[PDB]
Amino acid sequence: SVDQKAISTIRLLAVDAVAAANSGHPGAPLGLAPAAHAVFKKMRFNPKDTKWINRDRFVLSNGHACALLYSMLVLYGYDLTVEDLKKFRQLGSKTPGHPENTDVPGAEVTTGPLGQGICNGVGIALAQAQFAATYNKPDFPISDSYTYVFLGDGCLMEGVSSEASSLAGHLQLGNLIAFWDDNKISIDGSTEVAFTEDVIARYKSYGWHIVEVSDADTDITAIAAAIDEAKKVTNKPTLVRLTTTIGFGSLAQGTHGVHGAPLKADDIKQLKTKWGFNPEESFAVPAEVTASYNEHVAENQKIQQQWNELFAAYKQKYPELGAELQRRLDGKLPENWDKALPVYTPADAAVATRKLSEIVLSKIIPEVPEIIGGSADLTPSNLTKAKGTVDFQPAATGLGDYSGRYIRYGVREHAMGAIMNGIAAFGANYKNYGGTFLNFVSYAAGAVRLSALSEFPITWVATHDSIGLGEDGPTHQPIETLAHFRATPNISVWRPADGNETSAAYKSAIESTHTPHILALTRQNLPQLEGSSIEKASKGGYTLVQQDKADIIIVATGSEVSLAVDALKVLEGQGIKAGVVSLPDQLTFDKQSEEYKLSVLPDGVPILSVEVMSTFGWSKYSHQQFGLNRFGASGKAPEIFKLFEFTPEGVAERAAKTVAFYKGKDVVSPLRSAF
Amino acid sequence: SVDQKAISTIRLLAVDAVAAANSGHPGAPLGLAPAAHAVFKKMRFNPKDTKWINRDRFVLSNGHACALLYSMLVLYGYDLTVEDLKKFRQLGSKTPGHPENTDVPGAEVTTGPLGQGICNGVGIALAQAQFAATYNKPDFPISDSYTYVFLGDGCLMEGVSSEASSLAGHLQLGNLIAFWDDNKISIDGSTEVAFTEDVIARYKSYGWHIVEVSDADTDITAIAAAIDEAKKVTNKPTLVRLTTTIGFGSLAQGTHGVHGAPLKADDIKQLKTKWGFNPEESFAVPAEVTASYNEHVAENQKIQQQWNELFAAYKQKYPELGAELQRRLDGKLPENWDKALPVYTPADAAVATRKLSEIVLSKIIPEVPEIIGGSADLTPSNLTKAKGTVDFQPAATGLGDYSGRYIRYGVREHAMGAIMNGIAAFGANYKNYGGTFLNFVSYAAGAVRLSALSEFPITWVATHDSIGLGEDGPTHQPIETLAHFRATPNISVWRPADGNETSAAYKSAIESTHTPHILALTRQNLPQLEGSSIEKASKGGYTLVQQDKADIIIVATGSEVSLAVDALKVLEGQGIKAGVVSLPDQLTFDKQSEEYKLSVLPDGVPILSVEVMSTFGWSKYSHQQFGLNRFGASGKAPEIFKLFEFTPEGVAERAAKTVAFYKGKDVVSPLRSAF
Ligand SMILES: *CCCOP(=O)(O)OP(=O)(O)O
Ligand SMILES: *CCCOP(=O)(O)OP(=O)(O)O
Ligand SMILES: Cc1nccc(N)n1
Ligand SMILES: Cc1nccc(N)n1
Ligand SMILES: [Ca+2]
Ligand SMILES: [Ca+2]
């Protein structure tokens, strides 16, 4: 049949791509081709409009199997061709060895690191439910799409997928349909060596619905029926168990050797002959397969055309909601939304930056409907919920509604990070955030790095940023954390010193379209600074205290800016004139013009950095660095600062030593370099 | 009864400690005091010998509840007193806000970050099974101890605990007995808001045995009976569900407000009066409670005395095994074990450092019985298994034996990291390792940081360290990873360039007693260097190529050392004389004498660093830095190096620019500083 020919085409495109690269993973593509064929036939999508907001989404969580995804995209006429498949895994190609949403049309997210994609799927489904609850009206199903995820055994072993699956079951996400490639093989061999749990019983314990397809190597009728069954279960996510043979059809089917290495040439020949293809030909695409797939595309395009007319009628019946939805689909925030950001003066009281953040959220959430977010069981500590909003929960629980704006992630930092990526991936201008203690953002490093690589504008509200948290002690006090994330490409790491800087940090985080943000916020109160403003802090680094005859400039962030200002006063009594630079975001600062940056960090003056965590990175901006390169302590925070000499006198002493060290030396800006 | 009085004593010591600090967590201590009393009465331990190798181990995984642990340790006469409890959460005290194994007698591990302790318990139990299988003989139960873990709802939400619980069930670890504080409350309020899964059904799906105690606020008879039942189930770990009231007895019992803040003074008064204590008194320890606990200690000490005689008889009957066991309990490696380390010369072939690592392990595993380790489903890629060893598996599976040496962790990096910490915590000189790709060590950051804080000599075998891995692409290629871990206190991050450096890295990792190691290893082949040796590389940094009239020194690691040597040849043709420094471990180098370090990085010469990942940290050792501060690419590795100009010509160009930039300037060592 044409369906059987399509499945063979998919299988052989994937194998031929791996063969051309002499690199990659043929086994899972061979085993999952029937399911991929069946799922894509049920999906609504437009290869010529990858951003249609009511499309069904597909996520390949087992990203090493991406020759399968690329083959589907090519066959359906996305902006990816057989010529791109021939360049699989080659430098600069549109077919990298794991799918990248920035590079691959039709790749919703970046997968490859195991466990992430299923969590991203949870976030896409969460966003769809929130979006539908916000916009749908009687006779106006603006949003009714599904989220389809393929996953393997490795994904099921990674703890992040357990976190997200527990939460998805709790949230009753009935438009999520996941498919487990139950092939009993991982890299180390049989799953009997390390993975003997009853997966189905575990997923039932989370509140998922189960469908089992015992012959997923051939039974596309049953796979299609499993999708129909899943769609009838509207209050549970569904796991479809696909019992497959890894490498189906290969001489080496059912072995670990087919997981991750190219097939032998004689194996490929026998595959082709037994499926009716020419063993002398590679990258064959039978025209009847193209015709069949084109018919589905044409039907989907008529569905989108009707959706466009539905949207136009929605704008007539619901003018305000329609204009809001249009603005979001255009990627634009509300006009002048930032006028809601709080502004402070030096006459205002000292406030912890965690509380300033709460205040910002309380002002902007009512004005910017595309902001949603949550906490990983630290809501009363991170201060992440705006009073008077409701939680995102299924209404059946009585605890919230899908129109809610605040997500109770539970103690699930890693899944929160990957779910945030999925919410961003949904689109519709979602600007979403997640709160935890800064030190536990590290639990989510796998997902945070993918936020950066995927260019998603997610925001971590990362409170309790330092030894300033006090008594919880060194297991909770960050040292390395900002260095880690600042060293990752494309992460904006804001460490605001006061009210105006905290508003600038949120302006950056909410306006972002391609850069994730981490906001490092304090437990303890900080004064409002003389010289701060949203305008200046928006440059990432700025001159807080200008001193034309400076003997030294102190550059600092966060809680240490006020410390630097106090040190300036001590230094004045020692006959030393200091300037102060505040550097709330190194990435934003780095992106300013060279002339602006040199106006902040000029030649001809020693520069000392002060920040109560690792000194890594700080030599970009300073000649000498005063930081904390050892673990913290359990005690009252002011006593810890005193112990480590982060006091006005301790900073002044090091500033005076810095001035003395450069006496008789020619000093150029840390911004200068040889290349 | 005296048991009821002991439970009240525990509860009130914990509440009084929180009250004195005006900080900390009274709720879980109040709810878990009956269980703590019951479990410690069943445990074998010596407060005067915390390292007895056959003790039962206790882990408080819900580490915020540590006022409970400290109260037990005080009551049993560990080296912790009521005066220490009065200093709970105070700077410098022996009672920090979360338990630290380096600081607290009787704290086996460092907990506080949720999910870790249960995984540590899995590792303690794994080690006990391996140890018993190695040493026990008929009539000689050298090792027969249990591992008792307390955990809460937060621990059960963290994915790392799911990973470790799946693995522990697979491994049939029948001496592990965990207790879930089923109190239905977390920081955000009811568990109904985010945690509605059927925990018991999930644990059954992993192959655990379950015991439920419905009235754990009072029913110590049932808790004791649950322990007896768990001990009869020798082929499954057991989860005991303790249904408790958080804050039991408080006016605010059963609320989130009792989780994490001190009780009100009038609440404490009513607690005391209803339990028969004086409301005007704090830190009361009734002498009858001390007497009862002392009787259990005296019995345990007689058990240890008999164990010592059993051990002496074992040494007579099994002289070689007895001497091996004695050496391990003394913390000593075999005499001259390091003579087994492979040595190379520049005439030997190029080898990837992952393969050199395999070769080292193959030589040292047969000679050092306390080495065990595994991989997170990357055994044929990390090359972590010595041919001819057997896997650690329950014999019932037919796949290994508990005497085995190689652990199949599955795709569970975070739990592998925390299990490694537990294996180290067991003691007996275990030197244990875990393999994965370097980029996915980041999935385990929560546990890695605890290895450093806990001072455990664990080792990550972290292969595929850079863009040198090639086609898998930027989702797999580290950029920030070494900066992250080098910025963490107390992590030795070895990036060996060749065979001799790889042997030095293992010498350091296996000799370690207080510092975790990460070995960053290559996929691709590297040449044996002229000038390398185990002796020189053991200093962490050394002069590979000495040039008395150097115009520049190039400092490099790993794959970039050979690149630097090739660049030296290009520079010679441009009239520029370079030296080369190899810096295989920055931490080890930093610990050398100031004079040694200055002999490697002298004054008076520009120094350029070369390493194909983040430049963070490198200014400690260099004036200019050539690194990679953007994500990688999917292609053949040599093409990626060329794209980013990590070629002999690209390094030479930057070296020449560095020489030019410092013409006419006075240059001092990067090791100099102002303070
Ligand atoms: C995301 C899960 C994939 O896990 P594996 O089972 O290792 O993949 P496979 O293609 O079946 O070898
Ligand atoms: C390690 C798990 C503890 O989780 P929580 O339920 O948040 O602790 P609690 O003392 O019950 O509030
Ligand atoms: C998290 C992870 N581990 C191992 C392999 C992989 N692709 N991803
Ligand atoms: C990992 C974690 N998350 C939140 C709180 C905590 N103590 N630990
Ligand atoms: Ca598999
Ligand atoms: Ca709880």
UniProtKB/Swiss-Prot annotation, chains A, B:
Catalysed reaction equations from the record: D-sedoheptulose 7-phosphate + D-glyceraldehyde 3-phosphate = aldehydo-D-ribose 5-phosphate + D-xylulose 5-phosphate
Pfam families found in the cross-reference section: Transket_pyr, Transketolase_C_1, Transketolase_N
Xref: PROSITE patterns: TRANSKETOLASE_1, TRANSKETOLASE_2
Alphabetical list of CDD domains matching this protein: TPP_PYR_DXS_TK_like, TPP_TK
Named cofactor requirement(s): Mg(2+); Ca(2+); Mn(2+); Co(2+)
One GO molecular-function entry: transketolase activity
Residues of the active site: 413 (proton donor)
Gene Ontology terms: cellular component: cytosol; nucleus
Residues binding Mg(2+), per UniProt: 153, 183, 185
Annotated positions binding substrate: 25, 259, 354, 381, 464, 472, 523
Role according to the record: Catalyzes the transfer of a two-carbon ketol group from a ketose donor to an aldose acceptor, via a covalent intermediate with the cofactor thiamine pyrophosphate.
Family classification: Belongs to the transketolase family.
Name used for this protein in its record: Transketolase
Phylogenetic classification of the source organism: Eukaryota, Fungi, Dikarya, Ascomycota, Saccharomycotina
Gene behind this protein: TKT
